[PDB]
Design an enzyme around this catalytic site. Sequence first.
Site, PDB file in Angstrom:
ATOM      1  N   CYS B 106       0.833  -1.204   0.000  1.00  0.00           N
ATOM      2  CA  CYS B 106       0.000   0.000   0.000  1.00  0.00           C
ATOM      3  C   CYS B 106       0.869   1.255   0.000  1.00  0.00           C
ATOM      4  O   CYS B 106       1.555   1.552   0.988  1.00  0.00           O
ATOM      5  CB  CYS B 106      -0.949   0.018   1.196  1.00  0.00           C
ATOM      6  SG  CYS B 106      -2.009   1.498   1.154  1.00  0.00           S
ATOM      7  N   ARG B 109      -0.052   4.669   2.731  1.00  0.00           N
ATOM      8  CA  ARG B 109      -0.092   4.482   4.180  1.00  0.00           C
ATOM      9  C   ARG B 109       0.231   5.725   5.002  1.00  0.00           C
ATOM     10  O   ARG B 109       0.123   5.650   6.231  1.00  0.00           O
ATOM     11  CB  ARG B 109       0.853   3.363   4.586  1.00  0.00           C
ATOM     12  CG  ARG B 109       0.306   1.989   4.275  1.00  0.00           C
ATOM     13  CD  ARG B 109       1.352   0.967   4.638  1.00  0.00           C
ATOM     14  NE  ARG B 109       2.340   0.797   3.586  1.00  0.00           N
ATOM     15  CZ  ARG B 109       3.439   0.060   3.723  1.00  0.00           C
ATOM     16  NH1 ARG B 109       3.700  -0.535   4.886  1.00  0.00           N
ATOM     17  NH2 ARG B 109       4.270  -0.092   2.701  1.00  0.00           N
ATOM     18  N   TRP B 278      -9.231   6.292  -1.247  1.00  0.00           N
ATOM     19  CA  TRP B 278      -9.511   6.953  -2.514  1.00  0.00           C
ATOM     20  C   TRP B 278      -8.492   6.483  -3.544  1.00  0.00           C
ATOM     21  O   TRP B 278      -7.462   5.919  -3.196  1.00  0.00           O
ATOM     22  CB  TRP B 278      -9.483   8.472  -2.381  1.00  0.00           C
ATOM     23  CG  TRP B 278      -8.263   9.040  -1.717  1.00  0.00           C
ATOM     24  CD1 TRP B 278      -7.074   9.343  -2.314  1.00  0.00           C
ATOM     25  CD2 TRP B 278      -8.136   9.440  -0.343  1.00  0.00           C
ATOM     26  NE1 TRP B 278      -6.203   9.874  -1.394  1.00  0.00           N
ATOM     27  CE2 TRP B 278      -6.829   9.953  -0.177  1.00  0.00           C
ATOM     28  CE3 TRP B 278      -8.996   9.402   0.765  1.00  0.00           C
ATOM     29  CZ2 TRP B 278      -6.360  10.435   1.051  1.00  0.00           C
ATOM     30  CZ3 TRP B 278      -8.531   9.873   1.988  1.00  0.00           C
ATOM     31  CH2 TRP B 278      -7.228  10.384   2.120  1.00  0.00           C
ATOM     32  N   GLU B 283      -4.211   3.626 -10.984  1.00  0.00           N
ATOM     33  CA  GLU B 283      -5.068   2.446 -10.865  1.00  0.00           C
ATOM     34  C   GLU B 283      -6.140   2.447 -11.945  1.00  0.00           C
ATOM     35  O   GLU B 283      -6.377   1.431 -12.611  1.00  0.00           O
ATOM     36  CB  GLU B 283      -5.717   2.383  -9.483  1.00  0.00           C
ATOM     37  CG  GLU B 283      -4.749   2.287  -8.340  1.00  0.00           C
ATOM     38  CD  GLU B 283      -5.461   2.301  -7.009  1.00  0.00           C
ATOM     39  OE1 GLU B 283      -6.005   1.233  -6.641  1.00  0.00           O
ATOM     40  OE2 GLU B 283      -5.489   3.374  -6.353  1.00  0.00           O
TER      41      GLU B 283
HETATM   42  C1  HEM Z   1      -6.491   6.542   1.495  1.00  0.00           C
HETATM   43  C2  HEM Z   1      -5.979   6.454   0.269  1.00  0.00           C
HETATM   44  C3  HEM Z   1      -5.322   5.163  -0.270  1.00  0.00           C
HETATM   45  C4  HEM Z   1      -4.559   5.097  -1.365  1.00  0.00           C
HETATM   46  C5  HEM Z   1      -4.155   6.261  -2.284  1.00  0.00           C
HETATM   47  C6  HEM Z   1      -4.129   3.729  -1.548  1.00  0.00           C
HETATM   48  C7  HEM Z   1      -3.327   3.225  -2.557  1.00  0.00           C
HETATM   49  C8  HEM Z   1      -3.044   1.900  -2.848  1.00  0.00           C
HETATM   50  C9  HEM Z   1      -2.525   1.332  -4.086  1.00  0.00           C
HETATM   51  C10 HEM Z   1      -2.163   2.119  -5.372  1.00  0.00           C
HETATM   52  C11 HEM Z   1      -2.383   0.011  -3.906  1.00  0.00           C
HETATM   53  C12 HEM Z   1      -1.880  -0.998  -4.962  1.00  0.00           C
HETATM   54  C13 HEM Z   1      -3.161  -1.445  -5.652  1.00  0.00           C
HETATM   55  C14 HEM Z   1      -2.905  -2.264  -6.885  1.00  0.00           C
HETATM   56  O1  HEM Z   1      -2.168  -1.758  -7.766  1.00  0.00           O
HETATM   57  O2  HEM Z   1      -3.459  -3.401  -6.979  1.00  0.00           O
HETATM   58  C15 HEM Z   1      -2.822  -0.321  -2.559  1.00  0.00           C
HETATM   59  C16 HEM Z   1      -2.871  -1.567  -1.953  1.00  0.00           C
HETATM   60  C17 HEM Z   1      -3.344  -1.943  -0.698  1.00  0.00           C
HETATM   61  N1  HEM Z   1      -4.033  -1.135   0.145  1.00  0.00           N
HETATM   62 FE1  HEM Z   1      -4.015   1.011  -0.007  1.00  0.00          FE
HETATM   63  N2  HEM Z   1      -4.683   3.023  -0.528  1.00  0.00           N
HETATM   64  C18 HEM Z   1      -5.424   3.822   0.288  1.00  0.00           C
HETATM   65  C19 HEM Z   1      -6.144   3.371   1.395  1.00  0.00           C
HETATM   66  C20 HEM Z   1      -6.148   2.125   2.010  1.00  0.00           C
HETATM   67  C21 HEM Z   1      -6.870   1.738   3.206  1.00  0.00           C
HETATM   68  C22 HEM Z   1      -7.826   2.685   3.959  1.00  0.00           C
HETATM   69  C23 HEM Z   1      -6.581   0.445   3.472  1.00  0.00           C
HETATM   70  C24 HEM Z   1      -7.058  -0.458   4.638  1.00  0.00           C
HETATM   71  C25 HEM Z   1      -7.535   0.023   5.792  1.00  0.00           C
HETATM   72  C26 HEM Z   1      -5.634  -0.015   2.465  1.00  0.00           C
HETATM   73  C27 HEM Z   1      -5.069  -1.270   2.354  1.00  0.00           C
HETATM   74  C28 HEM Z   1      -4.367  -1.803   1.294  1.00  0.00           C
HETATM   75  C29 HEM Z   1      -3.846  -3.142   1.178  1.00  0.00           C
HETATM   76  C30 HEM Z   1      -4.018  -4.241   2.257  1.00  0.00           C
HETATM   77  C31 HEM Z   1      -3.239  -3.233  -0.011  1.00  0.00           C
HETATM   78  C32 HEM Z   1      -2.519  -4.488  -0.556  1.00  0.00           C
HETATM   79  C33 HEM Z   1      -3.416  -5.176  -1.560  1.00  0.00           C
HETATM   80  C34 HEM Z   1      -2.812  -6.444  -2.057  1.00  0.00           C
HETATM   81  O3  HEM Z   1      -1.862  -6.948  -1.396  1.00  0.00           O
HETATM   82  O4  HEM Z   1      -3.311  -6.925  -3.109  1.00  0.00           O
HETATM   83  N3  HEM Z   1      -5.424   1.025   1.611  1.00  0.00           N
HETATM   84  N4  HEM Z   1      -3.209   0.854  -1.985  1.00  0.00           N
HETATM   85  N1  V5G Z   2      -6.396   3.478  -3.902  1.00  0.00           N
HETATM   86  C1  V5G Z   2      -6.958   2.348  -3.425  1.00  0.00           C
HETATM   87  C2  V5G Z   2      -7.322   2.265  -2.083  1.00  0.00           C
HETATM   88  C3  V5G Z   2      -7.898   1.095  -1.620  1.00  0.00           C
HETATM   89  C4  V5G Z   2      -8.112   0.043  -2.502  1.00  0.00           C
HETATM   90  C5  V5G Z   2      -7.727   0.159  -3.832  1.00  0.00           C
HETATM   91  C6  V5G Z   2      -7.961  -0.974  -4.809  1.00  0.00           C
HETATM   92  C7  V5G Z   2      -6.670  -1.709  -5.128  1.00  0.00           C
HETATM   93  C8  V5G Z   2      -6.615  -2.836  -4.148  1.00  0.00           C
HETATM   94  C9  V5G Z   2      -6.176  -2.578  -2.860  1.00  0.00           C
HETATM   95  C10 V5G Z   2      -6.151  -3.605  -1.927  1.00  0.00           C
HETATM   96  C11 V5G Z   2      -6.551  -4.888  -2.294  1.00  0.00           C
HETATM   97  C12 V5G Z   2      -6.986  -5.147  -3.584  1.00  0.00           C
HETATM   98  O1  V5G Z   2      -7.391  -6.410  -3.932  1.00  0.00           O
HETATM   99  C13 V5G Z   2      -7.054  -7.569  -3.173  1.00  0.00           C
HETATM  100  C14 V5G Z   2      -7.401  -8.799  -3.991  1.00  0.00           C
HETATM  101  C15 V5G Z   2      -7.674  -8.699  -5.354  1.00  0.00           C
HETATM  102  C16 V5G Z   2      -7.990  -9.830  -6.099  1.00  0.00           C
HETATM  103  C17 V5G Z   2      -8.037 -11.079  -5.482  1.00  0.00           C
HETATM  104  C18 V5G Z   2      -8.351 -12.228  -6.209  1.00  0.00           C
HETATM  105  C19 V5G Z   2      -8.389 -13.458  -5.551  1.00  0.00           C
HETATM  106  C20 V5G Z   2      -8.113 -13.513  -4.183  1.00  0.00           C
HETATM  107  N2  V5G Z   2      -8.143 -14.695  -3.515  1.00  0.00           N
HETATM  108  N3  V5G Z   2      -7.810 -12.385  -3.499  1.00  0.00           N
HETATM  109  C21 V5G Z   2      -7.767 -11.183  -4.118  1.00  0.00           C
HETATM  110  C22 V5G Z   2      -7.450 -10.046  -3.379  1.00  0.00           C
HETATM  111  C23 V5G Z   2      -7.029  -4.112  -4.520  1.00  0.00           C
HETATM  112  N4  V5G Z   2      -7.156   1.304  -4.260  1.00  0.00           N
END
Ligand code: HEM
Ligand code: V5G
Lengths: 400, 402
Positions: B106, B109, B278, B283
């Site tokens: 993320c 953060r 947001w 993305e």
């Molecule tokens: C507030 C503005 C936020 C922005 C700009 C942001 C941005 C991003 C971006 C660009 C990614 C990579 C997504 C991708 O390319 O698939 C990501 C992943 C992630 N975000 Fe954030 N995010 C925000 C808020 C949050 C919040 C509020 C949470 C949880 C409370 C969170 C939890 C996560 C997690 C767990 C991932 C990892 C997803 C994965 O491993 O597939 N995010 N975020």
């Molecule tokens: N800016 C912003 C902020 C919050 C969320 C996002 C969307 C990008 C995102 C963030 C975190 C998690 C995520 O997706 C997790 C995922 C996706 C596909 C899956 C398919 C199979 C599986 N078992 N798990 C999965 C988990 C996407 N953007």
Amino acid sequence: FPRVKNWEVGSITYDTLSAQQQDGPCTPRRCLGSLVFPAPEQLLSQARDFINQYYSSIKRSGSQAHEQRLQEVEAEVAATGTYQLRESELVFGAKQAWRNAPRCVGRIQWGKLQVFDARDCRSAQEMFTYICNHIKYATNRGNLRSAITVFPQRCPGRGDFRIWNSQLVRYAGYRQQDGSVRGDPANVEITELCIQHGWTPGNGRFDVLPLLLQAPDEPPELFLLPPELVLEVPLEHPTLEWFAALGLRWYALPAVSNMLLEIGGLEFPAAPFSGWYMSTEIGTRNLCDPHRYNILEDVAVCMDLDTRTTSSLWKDKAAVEINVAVLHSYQLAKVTIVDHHAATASFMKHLENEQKARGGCPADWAWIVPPISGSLTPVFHQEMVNYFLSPAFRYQPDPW
Amino acid sequence: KFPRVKNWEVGSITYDTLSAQAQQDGPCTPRRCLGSLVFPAPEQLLSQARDFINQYYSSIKRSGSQAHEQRLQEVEAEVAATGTYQLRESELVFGAKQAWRNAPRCVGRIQWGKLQVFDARDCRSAQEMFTYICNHIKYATNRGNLRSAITVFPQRCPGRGDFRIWNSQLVRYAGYRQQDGSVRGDPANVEITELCIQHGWTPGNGRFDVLPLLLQAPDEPPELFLLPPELVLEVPLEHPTLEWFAALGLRWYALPAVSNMLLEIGGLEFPAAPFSGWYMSTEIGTRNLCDPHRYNILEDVAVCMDLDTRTTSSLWKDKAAVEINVAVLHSYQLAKVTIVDHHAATASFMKHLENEQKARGGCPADWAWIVPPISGSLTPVFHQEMVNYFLSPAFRYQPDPW
Ligand code: HEM
Ligand SMILES: Nc1cccc(CCc2cccc(OCc3ccc4ccc(N)nc4c3)c2)n1
Ligand code: HEM
Ligand SMILES: Nc1cccc(CCc2cccc(OCc3ccc4ccc(N)nc4c3)c2)n1
Ligand SMILES: Nc1cccc(CCc2cccc(OCc3ccc4ccc(N)nc4c3)c2)n1
Ligand SMILES: C[C@H](O)[C@H](O)[C@H]1CNc2nc(N)[nH]c(=O)c2N1
Ligand SMILES: C[C@H](O)[C@H](O)[C@H]1CNc2nc(N)[nH]c(=O)c2N1
Ligand SMILES: [Gd]
Ligand SMILES: [Zn+2]
């Protein structure tokens, strides 16, 4: 065996090659994959492995010649502590070191490599001669040919051959009284060493540095590259008429000279190699990195972009146009260059070739994906496995 | 023992001492790095619970206080009597923010301390899940002035089914598989689209049909709920100087709300805990719209821009993708919907790294996911070495509920 997926197509392969000899920086507790720099009995083990690889490549494994060469290397290591590669073994070994390099996107070319054997080199002056022949051959008036020149190997109780320059062609960087740099900040260190060894510095932004060549147990010696040997490309843009006025230029030949070539446990600290440029190296890293020439905002401002707000994406627009100018200028000058789209598509072919030939391919995702437009290229969606095979090119400490 | 971490733009160096607290093992070994892969009772529970409680009382500077000692005893007695324990509301709030703070992929953060936590652990039915999710969406969307939020449904419990949200996000566009193999709509959602049709949804046939929610209460089959259109704020896409761009009919939704991850806090597992922030504009513009296996609009935009698509060396791909991202940023700003570009977001992540070095001695970060998918080396994170490891509390991948 790691499962490796391509997320664009959904295809799955298994890396069986990773089971084959050195250890990187990662552990089960934390991944350090993003870091830039992660007896006679040991020599014979590596020698034996390399000779086995060579007799496989020429389709004579288990043959009589194979067993006699292994015995011959054992006998030489017992009598001398080291051994000597045959010329064809050196060539095969240099090609394998390229094939095995995880951070090189250009490895579709690995079997086409001109090897210059310089293991008879005795002096820095002879070293200079070999380097000039290399530059001339590899440049080929702009039709660039990959090449490597291999100087004598390391041996105990005797200093190394070393090329102190990081590349054969480098632009000077002159430290200013205020901390900033005129010219290339990457080369400040070697520029000052050139000056401390008697080079008369210039004061331009693109001054070609002299070579500092070290023969065994001697101070480094200064050699000036004849200008007709160093082909350069003035940078212009196809529609931005003012771009030429910026006076930007780059050189044709990327020739790395500070890495160590390792073959069969033998070490070659001086073994410069050259290919041709991928355009993002020049247009994105060398010209736009903030710790390099850092001209991104100069270009954006001349493009009349709104640079007071990031969300206009002025950085992205200017960077693309600098990369367009690099491609256009090299093509106009008839100097070999490859854009990042064509280079990554060929690397995907290389991965497919290596899967069939060896069961895998060591690849460093962070270095294979280009520094602009990453996900627009097919390597972005391709999982990769990073590991160290030998023969190899390795980093080594600076000679000073 | 502690990894040296260098920034190559500035030359500065830190040591990551936080990585020693890594609790789970990742996929790499000394012999090969697998960092680019997308997918890598009582005493066990009690030591995870004690660690979390200890974390909590340290966060409030009340370590070793009578309250700290009392809570550890209370949790230890609850686990012995019931086999599990219940978090206090303040602990849940801290735990959710920590899981976000700990997420290596993320880039957002810097925001981790500002998170609205809706306590839905009393939820009983799928109908009531729908009420909480609608309230979450309304609060988080806030007419375009987006606010980060998480809603956490009841924890996993032996002998009972899980609460699950079948959808991967609260807002998703349908994907309809064609005869030729292609997809009308979002190819990423073909599976959940078909699952919605098999539970009775009457499908549309547009490119941007908002899917219904499939909500699963314990030991019940999933139940289908339609989101009221006024809840789902959308942004029509236009470009500030390419006037034909608006005629393309492209749009995207305001709220990224991930609903398929598991939240783990102190050994407890919350399989339904949707969270939202947001968007960062890449993305939408680079991944969702330009990925070849997604909407894949890149070449059409290039043709419409009158770019020469016959040779790659014109960099037509790069130019079209930059203009699609400009359109996304321009359109959300025009609509007054919060969005961040990849420059501002990576600049703030660098500040987050500095804060976390002082606060905790490091920060788990996955370089391949932090570096944006266009213009990587134009952002500061490109030149930053990163250490990737797994801390708890954490958001985890989990299997699809079907
Ligand atoms: C507030 C503005 C936020 C922005 C700009 C942001 C941005 C991003 C971006 C660009 C990614 C990579 C997504 C991708 O390319 O698939 C990501 C992943 C992630 N975000 Fe954030 N995010 C925000 C808020 C949050 C919040 C509020 C949470 C949880 C409370 C969170 C939890 C996560 C997690 C767990 C991932 C990892 C997803 C994965 O491993 O597939 N995010 N975020
Ligand atoms: N800016 C912003 C902020 C919050 C969320 C996002 C969307 C990008 C995102 C963030 C975190 C998690 C995520 O997706 C997790 C995922 C996706 C596909 C899956 C398919 C199979 C599986 N078992 N798990 C999965 C988990 C996407 N953007
Ligand atoms: C022929 C055309 C070639 C192309 C287009 C090419 C392309 C590239 C690029 C873009 C990189 C990334 C380097 C960086 O960003 O610092 C790289 C790395 C590398 N290349 Fe190639 N290369 C070519 C030829 C060669 C040859 C001939 C050799 C050796 C025989 C070689 C060995 C390496 C090695 C060892 C690296 C590792 C870089 C490092 O660790 O710093 N390459 N190449
Ligand atoms: N297309 C292309 C083809 C061949 C070469 C190039 C140049 C990019 C490149 C490739 C391989 C190695 C390399 O540089 C290694 C290096 C650089 C700086 C160092 C500083 C200190 C030190 N101890 N080692 C270093 C090693 C560059 N491009
Ligand atoms: N409103 C506005 C708002 C904030 C800042 C500015 C200043 C714009 C600016 C800043 C710095 C340099 C600069 O130099 C523009 C320039 C130079 C040469 C050109 C040659 C050809 C051409 N077509 N354009 C050129 C533009 C501008 N302004
Ligand atoms: C920290 C980061 O890993 C480092 O700066 C890398 C990233 N990827 C790279 N990729 C290439 N091709 N060349 C580089 O110099 C780098 N630098
Ligand atoms: C194979 C590769 O690691 C994989 O496709 C990753 C790379 N980096 C990414 N980065 C982000 N932000 N999102 C992603 O989905 C991915 N995918
Ligand atoms: Gd226009
Ligand atoms: Zn790793």
